[PDB]
RNA sequence: UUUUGUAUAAUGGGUCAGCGACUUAUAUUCUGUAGCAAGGUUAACCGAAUAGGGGAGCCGAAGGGAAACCGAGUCUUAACU
RNA sequence: CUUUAAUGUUUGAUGUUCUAACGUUGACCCGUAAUCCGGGUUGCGGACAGUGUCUGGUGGGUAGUUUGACUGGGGCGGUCUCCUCCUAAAGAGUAACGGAGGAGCACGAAGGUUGGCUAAUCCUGGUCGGACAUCAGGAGGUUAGUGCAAUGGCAUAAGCCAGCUUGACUGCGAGCGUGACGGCGCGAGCAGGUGCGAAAGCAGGUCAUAGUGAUCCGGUGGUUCUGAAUGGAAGGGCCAUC
């Protein structure tokens, strides 16, 4: 049987040119008024997954 | 807590608004300031809204 | 509250409503005393004490609006 | 027992010491008050943190009529 | 939609490049409707692209060999 | 065997002989080795059939962006030194 | 067009009457040599009762489960996130049901500039007035003050007093600090507009450190980015926000 991908993860990480994964920053969904504009704008661009958590992601998306 | 969120709608007709907290009890008067509107790229007057 | 009739008929219904609300208030007060005594009682061994009962008592601590201005005799300082 | 709570450590202190070559913008000291005042070629943030304003060498000095410690960056 | 390498234009047909003549040489999928020619390979022959969306960089390379890009 | 730690008065075993526990499809990643090499390889199936056909298809040679889209660049942005 | 006053007239409700649906665990006859069942006459009810679908109430009668952790054994008691000091051994970090205190905010000015000013306490004199109110001059030297705990700061004031004000701006960001990660913090400088000042300049909130909550699901504005034959639309996506 082919490995079933974790469908939740395929909605949050996208592969890149070299082999790293790109994800979206958290803390940008709701009650933001207390957050400084500097903090809001620094979370807008998409980030890349760190070193420690890379192992747990390749497990979830074998085919991606 | 007695300060409740308000939004400062713009006055250039575009859809753009800031948000802040205002004491609706001791300041019943509405706010209006001069803020930047990045749609028309000008310093226009921002009036108080819902 | 919509009432169909005249002022004289509606005034009695208004008074009845106030009397019933005061009676229900007193009943709720007495219930709160009775449950507070049980909350403050002991434990009697290694037994329950009823977390569900505690939650019910905590829920029973609600609030109601006293009639905003049942204003009474004003003040006039003679000179 | 009533007490028994505490706050996370804020990790303040001197991050770069004397004679250390820094790059522009690097933090020199994380501060609560102003124990170290801003000399030439350094800044002062809202958190009273002293950040480098030009790459060089860190130099602690005691200039001033009240003997208050100053940090300034030599240009190298 | 599918990419097209520049080098792939040498395996197509007697000169014309088109959606049907691209997929008749197993360069693109059968159900690929749109395509775009990319500066990735090298060409020498005078290929005439029938209808496609060759880029700005690759257009200056097709005509260099002697091609023609019409619609 | 389990433990910080056992001659331990902690566990197991009366003794011999026979049996008794990391395996098997499929899929994916890495390593070694072998074949070809900007190419590599077939599946079902056909077949006097471990040959030979079958290139449907899969991976790779191009990336960026949520997407249209652009393209060795792209996204952000009114625009980037 | 206005009030109503009538007779027709459709519908709705509340009733009374009837017989033909339906009930009969009333009587008689037949199948039949059968207190079952069926059929036929005859009464008694009768559009009720009863059953089917939908629906509100009740329902431990029955069934499926839940009922946290730390803990000088468990239970009872206390506690669970954030800030300040000490323990903490002169970098950073460092435990216990160790020793002491706070937070779940506030402010369209208590924010930004430009001007100006500098406290607590004590003494002498003086109308009501004293131990202490306001005035005068001497010692004084921060024992003062900070919007709210404590520590570190503050005279160039970060404390006090006024003018004009909205930078409590939009897009970015060299480079660093701290985290296992999620994340959090500091930031010169660049571009577009802006306030204060004669300018040099300062301003991307408040002397700093607490004043908080991921994801999912959904709500409200903007944007043809997408739109399942095509044109639209619904629904998604992106930005702002709840
Ligand atoms: Mg959103
Ligand atoms: Mg093919
Ligand atoms: Mg061991
Ligand atoms: Mg033991
Ligand atoms: Mg021994
Ligand atoms: Mg033994
Ligand atoms: Mg023995
Ligand atoms: Mg045992
Ligand atoms: Mg034994
Ligand atoms: Mg691509
Ligand atoms: Mg039960
Ligand atoms: Mg079960
Ligand atoms: Mg326990
Ligand atoms: Mg030490
Ligand atoms: Mg230390
Ligand atoms: Mg202030
Ligand atoms: Mg000043
Ligand atoms: Mg100030
Ligand atoms: Mg403060
Ligand atoms: Mg359509
Ligand atoms: Mg939408």
UniProtKB/Swiss-Prot annotation, chain A:
<dbReference type="InterPro" id="IPR018265">
    <property type="entry name" value="Ribosomal_bL35_CS"/>
</dbReference>
<dbReference type="InterPro" id="IPR037229">
    <property type="entry name" value="Ribosomal_bL35_sf"/>
</dbReference>
<dbReference type="Pfam" id="PF01632">
    <property type="entry name" value="Ribosomal_L35p"/>
</dbReference>
<comment type="similarity">
    <text>Belongs to the bacterial ribosomal protein bL35 family.</text>
</comment>
<dbReference type="InterPro" id="IPR001706">
    <property type="entry name" value="Ribosomal_bL35"/>
</dbReference>
<dbReference type="GO" id="GO:0006412">
    <property type="term" value="P:translation"/>
</dbReference>
<dbReference type="GO" id="GO:0022625">
    <property type="term" value="C:cytosolic large ribosomal subunit"/>
</dbReference>
<feature type="compositionally biased region" description="Basic residues">
    <location>
        <begin position="9"/>
        <end position="21"/>
    </location>
</feature>
<dbReference type="GO" id="GO:0003735">
    <property type="term" value="F:structural constituent of ribosome"/>
</dbReference>
<keyword id="KW-0689">Ribosomal protein</keyword>
<feature type="region of interest" description="Disordered">
    <location>
        <begin position="1"/>
        <end position="21"/>
    </location>
</feature>
<dbReference type="InterPro" id="IPR021137">
    <property type="entry name" value="Ribosomal_bL35-like"/>
</dbReference>
Swiss-Prot record, chain B:
<dbReference type="Pfam" id="PF00471">
    <property type="entry name" value="Ribosomal_L33"/>
</dbReference>
<dbReference type="GO" id="GO:0022625">
    <property type="term" value="C:cytosolic large ribosomal subunit"/>
</dbReference>
<keyword id="KW-0689">Ribosomal protein</keyword>
<dbReference type="InterPro" id="IPR018264">
    <property type="entry name" value="Ribosomal_bL33_CS"/>
</dbReference>
<dbReference type="InterPro" id="IPR001705">
    <property type="entry name" value="Ribosomal_bL33"/>
</dbReference>
<keyword id="KW-0488">Methylation</keyword>
<dbReference type="GO" id="GO:0000027">
    <property type="term" value="P:ribosomal large subunit assembly"/>
</dbReference>
<dbReference type="GO" id="GO:0002181">
    <property type="term" value="P:cytoplasmic translation"/>
</dbReference>
<comment type="subunit">
    <text>Part of the 50S ribosomal subunit. Cross-links to the P and E site tRNAs.</text>
</comment>
<dbReference type="GO" id="GO:0046677">
    <property type="term" value="P:response to antibiotic"/>
</dbReference>
<dbReference type="GO" id="GO:0005829">
    <property type="term" value="C:cytosol"/>
</dbReference>
<keyword id="KW-0694">RNA-binding</keyword>
UniProtKB/Swiss-Prot annotation, chain C:
<comment type="function">
    <text>A translation factor that gates the progression of the 70S ribosomal initiation complex (IC, containing tRNA(fMet) in the P-site) into the translation elongation cycle by using a mechanism sensitive to the ATP/ADP ratio. Binds to the 70S ribosome E-site where it modulates the state of the translating ribosome during subunit translocation.</text>
</comment>
<feature type="region of interest" description="PtIM">
    <location>
        <begin position="5"/>
        <end position="79"/>
    </location>
</feature>
<protein>
    <recommendedName>
        <fullName>Energy-dependent translational throttle protein EttA</fullName>
    </recommendedName>
</protein>
<comment type="similarity">
    <text>Belongs to the ABC transporter superfamily. ABCF family. Translational throttle EttA subfamily.</text>
</comment>
<comment type="subunit">
    <text>Monomer at concentrations found in vivo, exists in a slowly reversible monomer-homodimer equilibrium. Probably contacts ribosomal proteins L1, L5, L33 and S7, the 16S and 23S rRNA and the P-site containing tRNA(fMet).</text>
</comment>
Swiss-Prot record, chain D:
<dbReference type="GO" id="GO:0090070">
    <property type="term" value="P:positive regulation of ribosome biogenesis"/>
</dbReference>
<keyword id="KW-0820">tRNA-binding</keyword>
<protein>
    <recommendedName>
        <fullName>Large ribosomal subunit protein bL27</fullName>
    </recommendedName>
</protein>
<keyword id="KW-0687">Ribonucleoprotein</keyword>
<dbReference type="InterPro" id="IPR018261">
    <property type="entry name" value="Ribosomal_bL27_CS"/>
</dbReference>
<keyword id="KW-0689">Ribosomal protein</keyword>
<dbReference type="GO" id="GO:0043022">
    <property type="term" value="F:ribosome binding"/>
</dbReference>
<dbReference type="GO" id="GO:0019843">
    <property type="term" value="F:rRNA binding"/>
</dbReference>
<dbReference type="GO" id="GO:0002181">
    <property type="term" value="P:cytoplasmic translation"/>
</dbReference>
<dbReference type="GO" id="GO:0022625">
    <property type="term" value="C:cytosolic large ribosomal subunit"/>
</dbReference>
<keyword id="KW-0699">rRNA-binding</keyword>
<dbReference type="GO" id="GO:0005737">
    <property type="term" value="C:cytoplasm"/>
</dbReference>
């Amino acid at each position: 049987p082919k490995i079933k991908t974790v469908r939740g993860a395929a909605k949050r990480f996208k592969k890149t040119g070299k082999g790293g994964f790109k994800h979206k920053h958290a803390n940008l969904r709701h009650i933001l008024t207390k957050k400084a504009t500097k903090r809001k704008r620094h979370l807008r661009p998409k980030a890349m997954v760190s070193k420690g958590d890379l192992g747990l992601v390749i497990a979830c998306l074998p085919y991606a | 807590g007695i300060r409740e969120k308000i939004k400062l709608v713009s006055s250039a007709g575009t859809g753009h608004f800031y948000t802040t907290t205002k004491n609706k009890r001791t300041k019943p008067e509405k706010l209006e300031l001069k803020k930047f509107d990045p749609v028309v790229r000008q310093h226009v007057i921002y009036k108080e809204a819902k | 509250i919509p009432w169909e009739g005249n002022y004289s008929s509606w005034l009695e219904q208004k008074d009845q409503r106030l009397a019933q609300e005061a009676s229900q208030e007193a009943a709720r007060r007495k219930s709160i005393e009775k449950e507070l005594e049980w909350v403050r009682q002991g434990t009697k061994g290694r037994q329950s004490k009823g977390k569900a009962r505690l939650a019910r008592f905590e829920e029973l601590n609600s609030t109601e609006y006293q009639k905003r201005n049942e204003t009474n005799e004003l003040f006039i300082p003679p000179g | 027992t009533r007490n028994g709570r505490d706050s996370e450590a804020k990790r303040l202190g001197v991050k770069r010491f004397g004679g250390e070559s820094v790059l522009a913008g690097s933090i020199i000291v994380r501060q609560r008050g102003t124990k170290f005042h801003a000399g030439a070629n350094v800044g002062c943030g809202r958190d009273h943190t002293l950040f480098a304003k030009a790459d060089g060498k860190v130099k602690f000095e005691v200039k001033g009529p009240k003997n208050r410690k100053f940090i300034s960056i030599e240009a190298e | 939609t599918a990419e097209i390498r520049l080098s792939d234009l040498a395996k197509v047909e007697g000169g014309v490049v088109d959606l049907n003549t691209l997929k008749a040489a197993n360069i693109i999928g059968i159900q690929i409707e749109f395509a775009k020619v990319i500066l990735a390979g090298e060409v020498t022959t005078p290929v005439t692209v029938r209808g496609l969306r060759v880029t700005k960089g690759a257009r200056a390379a097709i005509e260099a060999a002697g091609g023609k890009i019409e619609e």
